[PDB]
Design a protein around this ligand. Structure first.
Ligand SMILES: Nc1nc2c(ncn2[C@@H]2O[C@H](COP(=O)(O)OP(=O)(O)NP(=O)(O)O)[C@@H](O)[C@H]2O)c(=O)[nH]1
Ligand SMILES: [Mg+2]
Length: 165
């Protein structure tokens, strides 16, 4: 069984790093703005069932994503919205991504979660947890704060995606 999870959010929030961290088990140290359609896969076992989790690493840049959104939303099973904890603007963008999702989803059942990334940059954090939690609550989504680069030692990125499956 294929479980398609799309990862949506502003350019530079770390979507490519999160998806690569989950699928490959390590941080990608060479990344550039994602262009077009990229996805990566990982075979997992949940409760005895072998499942192929397929993470769609969407483009944040308008030029590269504009004609791709119906590919992103084709046969989607879950949605992960990402902001950068060090960039308040990326958090302010979220209502726009959430509305795009609303317009493209048919099934009212599909899980959506909110992820703040780059929590390792403690000194540079701009989005307080309480603010993000209040917003997540308003949209009936759970909130996770994590790091694609460093939080693993806090037991977080794997758990966030696994729990969706
Ligand atoms: N310190 C830190 N840097 C991170 C983390 N995640 C990503 N980065 C860095 O943030 C930058 C953007 O990462 P990237 O995954 O390419 O972003 P993106 O959301 O895929 N961008 P695009 O939408 O344009 O493809 C990179 O320089 C990457 O090294 C993180 O958890 N911690
Ligand atoms: Mg990318």
């Amino acid at each position: 069984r294929i479980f398609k999870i799309i990862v949506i959010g502003d350019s530079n929030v770390g979507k490519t790093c999160l998806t690569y961290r989950f699928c490959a088990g390590r941080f990608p140290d060479r990344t550039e703005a994602t262009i077009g359609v990229d996805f990566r896969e990982r075979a997992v076992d949940i409760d005895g069932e072998r499942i192929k989790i397929q993470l769609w690493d969407t483009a944040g840049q308008e030029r590269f994503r504009k004609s791709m959104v119906q590919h992103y939303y084709r046969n989607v099973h879950a949605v992960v919205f990402v902001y950068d904890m060090t960039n308040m603007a990326s958090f302010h963008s979220l209502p726009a991504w959430i509305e795009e999702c609303k317009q493209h989803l048919l099934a009212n059942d599909i899980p959506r979660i909110l992820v703040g990334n780059k929590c390792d940059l403690r000194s540079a954090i701009q989005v307080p947890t309480d603010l993000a939690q209040k917003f997540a609550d308003t949209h009936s989504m759970p909130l996770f704060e994590t790091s694609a680069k460093n939080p693993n030692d806090n037991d977080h990125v794997e758990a966030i995606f696994m729990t969706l499956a």
